[PDB]
């Protein structure tokens, strides 16, 4: 419950309709229900799961940043005292964002990761685990900040090790994972040199493998390679 009474296939069908309607909260709730059926997810289903939550949490993160910026300006010299409301409402949004991250991490831990044996599924779920600890790290300010950062790092690193052993350098999941791990280094771990080196090496190793691909695979890989390039251009 509340998706307990709906057929797994109906949850998946509804998740696709919610995506078409840009109803990402519904899409995420339907995919949560589908995972909770206990069966492993197909490639297409892992994509739906990831898209639903990435959109939900992306909206909360963009809102948190807006409110954080306002709260920071309220704490500058000569800003007029406006009471607790800005902090309260930033905390409300922050708490809801944390709940979403905790829900995704819960799904991964119970029991997506442990039943994921193929590289494409294992690396995908570990990247999500890195990503959702990373979003928790974006808002973390207390005793646990270091441990949350290290949980993001450890998950990304385990996914990196598997992807390097088991997937070609042009695999979209390999390239997406490196893109995100490189962002983690740059803006969470205060290691811009590592972020740059990772984005560079990843781009160049994929460049050299392009010649093995079909036209369609070439399009898939070069799309994410351009995101690596956009970040290198921004950072250098």
């Amino acid at each position: 419950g509340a998706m307990g009474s709906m057929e797994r296939a109906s949850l998946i069908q509804k998740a696709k309709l919610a995506e078409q309607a840009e109803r990402y909260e519904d899409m995420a709730a339907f995919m949560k229900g589908a995972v909770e059926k206990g069966e492993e997810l197909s490639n297409e289903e892992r994509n739906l799961l990831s898209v639903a939550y990435k959109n939900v949490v992306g909206g909360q993160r963009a809102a948190w940043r807006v409110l954080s910026s306002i709260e920071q300006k309220s704490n500058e010299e000569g800003s007029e005292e406006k009471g607790p409301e800005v902090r309260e409402y930033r905390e409300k949004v922050e708490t809801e964002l944390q709940g979403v991250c905790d829900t995704v991490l819960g799904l991964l831990d119970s029991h997506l990761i442990k039943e994921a044996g193929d590289a494409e599924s294992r690396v995908f779920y570990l990247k999500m685990k890195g990503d959702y600890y990373r979003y928790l790290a974006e808002v973390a300010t207390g005793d646990d900040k270091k441990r949350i950062i290290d949980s993001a790092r450890s998950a990304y690193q385990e996914a990196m090790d598997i992807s390097k052993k088991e997937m070609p350098p042009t695999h979209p999941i390999r390239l997406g994972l490196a893109l995100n791990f490189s962002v983690f280094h740059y803006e969470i771990a205060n290691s811009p040199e590592e972020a740059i080196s990772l984005a560079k090496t990843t781009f160049d190793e994929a460049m050299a493998d392009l010649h093995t691909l079909s036209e369609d695979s070439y399009k898939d890989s070069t799309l994410i390679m351009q995101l690596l390039r956009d970040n290198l251009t921004l950072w250098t």
Partner: peptide
């Protein structure tokens, strides 16, 4: 803004 995916 930097890209993630």
């Amino acid at each position: 803004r930097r890209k993630s995916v």
